Amino acid sequence: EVCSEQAETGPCRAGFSRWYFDVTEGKCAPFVYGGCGGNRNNFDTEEYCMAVCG
Amino acid sequence: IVGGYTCEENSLPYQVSLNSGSHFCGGSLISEQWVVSAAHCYKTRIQVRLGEHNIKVLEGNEQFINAAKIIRHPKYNRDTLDNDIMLIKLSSPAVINARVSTISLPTAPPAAGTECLISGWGNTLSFGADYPDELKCLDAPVLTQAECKASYPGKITNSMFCVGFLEGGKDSCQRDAGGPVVCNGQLQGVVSWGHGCAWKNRPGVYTKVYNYVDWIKDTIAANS
């Protein structure tokens, strides 16, 4: 269920490099996380994102 | 920074960056050993780089110094974003020269309507990703709390103020967080949050540094 949430930068203005499961690509893609809020489709690495969502 | 301009080299010697693998936030050097940033920029380990103009094209006279101490405001609130300010103590003193220099603490809050200088290596697009290598600048007015609260109903704490243009088009953005807002030579603000970047009726929300001047002095003092 978390694997189908959109990538959410959230309102904060940091530039953390994160990963989210993109249901269109059928795999994990990078995105920029602001550092607060967003959602749980938000992983530190490609490998862990794929274990949770692949 | 959206709708800004590449800063003159290096007319922003107090600008710093926070790094962990990559650049993730901005900051401001306020003494030889202390940097101010945002609390949502917290990580366990941070490298601070000073005197950078282009962050990927190094010119020899930038300083890389690890954080010895990384101290969030103790009333920082993850959910409301209240007290979004953090201090970093440099593991060794930065060398003051014409590339690396401090910015003064504020002696009074900014008047609404005053023009301020915001800076950072954040995203230069309101939609899509264009992360610049070169440091960007924006001149923008401090807005009234009326304008600020009208843009963000129910969300503006006493620690927050808006700087920007309600029309949209000009704003800080992702990777700018922690960076400085300077009005008339004093640090007034820390880049914080906003709804998108440079969107209509959605100005940038910044932490009021003036509210923390005693907490910053006490924290500097307690950590010698």
From Swiss-Prot, chain A:
Induction data: Increased levels during neuronal differentiation.
Disulphide-bridged cysteine pairs: C12-C36, C28-C49
Residues of the BPTI/Kunitz inhibitor domain: 6-53
UniProt modification remark: Proteolytically processed under normal cellular conditions. Cleavage either by alpha-secretase, beta-secretase or theta-secretase leads to generation and extracellular release of soluble APP peptides, S-APP-alpha and S-APP-beta, and the retention of corresponding membrane-anchored C-terminal fragments, C80, C83 and C99. Subsequent processing of C80 and C83 by gamma-secretase yields P3 peptides. This is the major secretory pathway and is non-amyloidogenic. Proteolytically cleaved by caspases during neuronal apoptosis.
Localisation: Cell membrane; Membrane; Perikaryon; Cell projection, Growth cone
Site (Reactive bond): R13, A14
Involvement in disease: Alzheimer disease 1: A form of Alzheimer disease, a neurodegenerative disorder characterized by progressive dementia, loss of cognitive abilities, and deposition of fibrillar amyloid proteins as intraneuronal neurofibrillary tangles, extracellular amyloid plaques and vascular amyloid deposits. The major constituents of these plaques are neurotoxic amyloid-beta protein 40 and amyloid-beta protein 42, that are produced by the proteolysis of the transmembrane APP protein.
Leftover remarks: Chelation of metal ions, notably copper, iron and zinc, can induce histidine-bridging between amyloid-beta molecules resulting in amyloid-beta-metal aggregates. The affinity for copper is much higher than for other transient metals and is increased under acidic conditions. Extracellular zinc-binding increases binding of heparin to APP and inhibits collagen-binding.
Complex and partners: Binds, via its C-terminus, to the PID domain of several cytoplasmic proteins, including APBB family members, the APBA family, MAPK8IP1, SHC1 and, NUMB and DAB1. Binding to DAB1 inhibits its serine phosphorylation. Interacts (via NPXY motif) with DAB2 (via PID domain); the interaction is impaired by tyrosine phosphorylation of the NPXY motif. Also interacts with GPCR-like protein BPP, APPBP1, IB1, KNS2 (via its TPR domains), APPBP2 (via BaSS) and DDB1. In vitro, it binds MAPT via the MT-binding domains. Associates with microtubules in the presence of ATP and in a kinesin-dependent manner.
Name under which the protein is recorded: Amyloid-beta precursor protein
Residue window of the full protein shown: 294 to 342 of 770
UniProtKB/Swiss-Prot annotation, chain B:
EC number(s) from the headed UniProt entry: 3.4.21.4
Description of how activity is regulated: Not inhibited by Kunitz-type trypsin inhibitors.
One cellular component (GO) term of this entry: tertiary granule lumen
Cysteines engaged in disulfide bonds, as pairs: C7-C137, C25-C41, C116-C183, C148-C162, C173-C197
Site entry: Required for specificity: D171
Catalytic reaction equation(s): Preferential cleavage: Arg-|-Xaa, Lys-|-Xaa
GO molecular function, one term: serine-type peptidase activity
Domain Peptidase S1: 1-221
Binding site for Ca(2+): E52, N54, V57, E59, E62
Gene label: PRSS3
Cofactor(s) in the UniProt record: Ca(2+)
Modified residues (Sulfotyrosine): Y131
Gene Ontology terms: biological process: antimicrobial humoral response; digestion; endothelial cell migration; proteolysis; zymogen activation
Expression (tissue specificity): Detected in pancreas and pancreatic fluid (at protein level). Expressed in pancreas and brain. Detected in ileum.
Superkingdom of this protein's organism: Eukaryota
Name the record gives this protein: Trypsin-3
Protein purpose: Digestive protease that cleaves proteins preferentially after an Arg residue and has proteolytic activity toward Kunitz-type trypsin inhibitors.
Keywords associated with the record: Calcium, Digestion, Disulfide bond, Hydrolase, Metal-binding, Protease, Secreted, Serine protease, Signal, Sulfation, Zymogen
